[PDB]
Design a protein around this ligand. Structure first.
Ligand SMILES: *[C@@H]1O[C@H](CO)[C@@H](O[C@@H]2O[C@H](CO)[C@@H](O[C@@H]3O[C@H](CO)[C@@H](O)[C@H](O)[C@@H]3O)[C@H](O)[C@H]2NC(C)=O)[C@H](O[C@@H]2O[C@@H](C)[C@@H](O)[C@@H](O)[C@@H]2O)[C@H]1NC(C)=O
Ligand SMILES: CCCCN1C[C@H](O)[C@@H](O)[C@H](O)[C@H]1CO
Length: 495
């Protein structure tokens, strides 16, 4: 519609947030052989558009990044975030006009064109109430399964509004944290405990049927799922005292649950097209978890992909984990399903305007893309200034922070860093080769849109400006510069 600049505000951190309210939010409005550049900087530029010429020749010894359009890697599924109870409550705390600008920021082409929404199956830490959908004890046939108001009045109507705003088809992803407690060895939503008994038994068939019941219930409200994960962070339920909703699975337990219960139960339902993602956990668990599950032909036939979380990335070099998994199982897509900053005990939950947190998002996304990952999903879409609500006070940060007392929301550097990918990398884009002429400190990734046009994202996490050239053998050269602490997305038609 109308380009509207960022209203910047400092809270004493490395960069600014962009301030939006009931009546204002920043928003957005290429001939060959010109390119488009979108730039965001620590100094305060927010996805600003500029253009350049593509030259026929280049001479120099500076950094050159050469597109290898014939070297084809993964297709992109997409980008988005999570509609938790906390996110829904924060969004709905705004006046309806401000709610609409927040939703448009994320889901509109006038915003950043999210096409993924992760939906918890009942309560997680980012809930104010602890509940499942089948809390009546020993209800093995699930006669009393139902969605409560957290879904029917809060999450579902918000998801519908997001879908209405989006011009791209939106894919929903569901993940459970805990089963009903009466299905669990420890009889509690949290702590160390798994499903009682063994895969193939009444407890496991009931838990498998719960997934179908969830999907049935959402489909009654006219929402269809792209995928479900087999459990959020199954490793969590293996840990003594784990503080909030979880459900423990070893990789063998998960393998046999998928083979015997979950896979066949979904396959025999009207939801047989919904994809099943395994793991949904820290990538250090790869490739071991992939080997355990995927080398059993009975489990493998049901698994579409492997979902990863980013929290222990420091213990898990991408080559040894993502790269090795891809090498062994290249037909089982890798998908980043949850990330947030501010979650470590020593970290401040919310740092309004943190450029570092921004760069953390984009560095992870680029690294993921360079190691075959097909999409990347943020955690809570919005939180309050404390990084909540959260029933166990496990507060964290969010690209959007809602200030209820001011009917205001703040878009953080994380929002724009994610936007440098989500806005410009449609579903069906394919990552292609990009080689550097010399060692450098930049993170860079090249992809091709479904129509054959090019997209390159370049992140400079250093304080030093790096002039550089991008070579496309089809079109020519783009002479540019990557300022210290910047992120650029470059777009051009190749035909
Ligand atoms: C919602 O957010 C928008 C953008 O921040 C607010 O509109 C803007 O309000 C500013 C007032 O703080 C306007 O600026 C002033 O300009 C004069 C010169 O013409 C200066 O002398 C002065 O120092 C200010 O800088 C600003 O122009 C305005 N609009 C835009 C599009 O930038 C909005 O504030 C509300 O609306 C405006 C138009 C005024 O009526 C304000 O009094 C009013 O608070 C924010 N909404 C709310 C309710 O906070
Ligand atoms: C190892 C750190 C995991 C971080 N958590 C993952 C879990 O899925 C979410 O429910 C949490 O909110 C998140 C942050 O503590």
């Amino acid at each position: 519609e109308f380009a509207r600049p960022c209203i910047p505000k400092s809270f004493g951190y490395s960069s600014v947030v962009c301030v939006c309210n009931a009546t204002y939010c920043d928003s957005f409005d290429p001939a060959l052989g010109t390119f488009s550049r979108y730039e965001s900087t620590r100094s305060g530029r927010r996805m600003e558009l500029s253009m350049g010429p593509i030259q026929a020749n280049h001479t120099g010894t500076g950094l050159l990044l050469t597109l290898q359009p014939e070297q084809k890697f993964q297709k992109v599924k997409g980008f988005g975030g999570a509609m938790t109870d906390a996110a829904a409550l924060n969004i709905l705390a705004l006046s309806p006009p401000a709610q609409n600008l927040l939703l448009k920021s994320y889901f509109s082409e006038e915003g950043i064109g999210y096409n993924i929404i992760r939906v918890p199956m009942a309560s997680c830490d980012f809930s104010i109430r602890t509940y499942t959908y089948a809390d009546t004890p020993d209800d093995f046939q699930l006669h009393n399964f139902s969605l409560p108001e957290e879904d029917t009045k809060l999450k579902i109507p918000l998801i519908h509004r997001a879908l209405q705003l989006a011009q791209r088809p939106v894919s929903l992803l569901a993940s459970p944290w805990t089963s009903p407690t009466w299905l669990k060895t420890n009889g509690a939503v949290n702590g160390k405990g798994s499903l009682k008994g063994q895969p193939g038994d009444i407890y496991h068939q009931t838990w498998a049927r719960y997934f179908v019941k969830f999907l049935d219930a959402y489909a009654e409200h006219k929402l269809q799922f792209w995928a479900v994960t087999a459990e959020n962070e199954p490793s969590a339920g293996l840990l003594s005292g784990y503080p909030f909703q979880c459900l423990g699975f070893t990789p063998e337990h998960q393998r046999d649950f998928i083979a015997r219960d979950l896979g066949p139960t979904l396959a025999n339902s009207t939801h047989h097209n919904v994809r099943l993602l395994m793991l949904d956990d820290q990538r250090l668990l790869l490739p071991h978890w992939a080997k355990v599950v995927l080398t059993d032909p009975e489990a493998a036939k049901y698994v579409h992909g492997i979902a990863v979380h980013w929290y222990l990335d420091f213990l898990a070099p991408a080559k040894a984990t993502l790269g090795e998994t891809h090498r062994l199982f290249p037909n089982t897509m890798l998908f980043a399903s949850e990330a947030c900053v501010g979650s470590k005990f020593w970290e401040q939950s919310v740092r309004l305007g943190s450029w570092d947190r921004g760069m953390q998002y984009s560095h992870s996304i680029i690294t993921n893309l360079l190691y075959h990952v097909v999409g990347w999903t943020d955690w809570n879409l919005a939180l309050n200034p404390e990084g909540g609500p959260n029933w166990v006070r496990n507060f964290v940060d969010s690209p959007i922070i809602v200030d209820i007392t001011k009917d205001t929301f703040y878009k953080q550097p994380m929002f724009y860093h994610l936007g440098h990918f989500s806005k410009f990398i449609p579903e069906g884009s394919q990552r292609v080769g990009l080689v550097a002429s010399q060692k450098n400190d930049l993170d860079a990734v090249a992809l091709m849109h479904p129509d054959g046009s090019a997209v390159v994202v370049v992140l400079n996490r250093s304080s030093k400006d790096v002039p550089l050239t991008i070579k496309d053998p089809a079109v020519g050269f783009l002479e540019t510069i990557s300022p210290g602490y910047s992120i650029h997305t470059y777009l051009w038609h190749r035909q």
